[PDB]
Design a binder for these strands. Structure first.
Lengths: 80, 80
DNA sequence: TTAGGAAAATTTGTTTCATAG
DNA sequence: AACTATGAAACAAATTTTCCT
């Protein structure tokens, strides 16, 4: 359960730039976009994840390793 | 300013794990570690984020003919 | 084994908000 | 100042399938 540090979230947001760079302000915007989701989560969100996982083609269940897992299809994602 | 969608976040959670794949309940946790973080620090966020970029030296400022921007030095996270 | 129930997946159904005509 | 048509997204929920005792 390693929790989330500023350090990390910043890495994650910089790394979601088209170019692996972002302006302080864009970073706010990233944080803001995310603040703007976690309070406006529902009681059932586990329902919403199960749902999106089945529904979109970008998520594909494979069976390997410890148990059955979920993986992304970067291609299918790129079109949405 | 919009939320990110389930789909985006979910994609992310899948990716955090370096193996680019994770079970359902491994995702529920990523989501929690977020849920948590934002319940905790919804303070003067912005301010933190210049304090870190500067402090943690895995964050580096570079010049674009765009403008002055931040990148991560991935070779300077993990450890040294 | 084999149940039996619960967690995962999957499927349908409602409703909203945002776009081009 | 509709009205038409389209589609993402979120949410609820209803069934079926896998997985864990």
């Amino acid at each position: 359960r390693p929790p989330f540090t500023y350090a990390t979230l910043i890495r994650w947001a910089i790394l979601e730039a088209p170019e692996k760079q972002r302006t302080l302000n864009e970073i706010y915007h990233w944080f803001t976009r995310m603040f703007a989701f976690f309070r406006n989560h529902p009681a059932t969100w586990k329902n919403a994840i199960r749902h999106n996982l089945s529904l979109h083609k970008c998520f594909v269940r494979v069976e390997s390793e410890k148990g059955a897992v979920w993986t992304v299809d970067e291609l299918e994602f790129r079109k949405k």
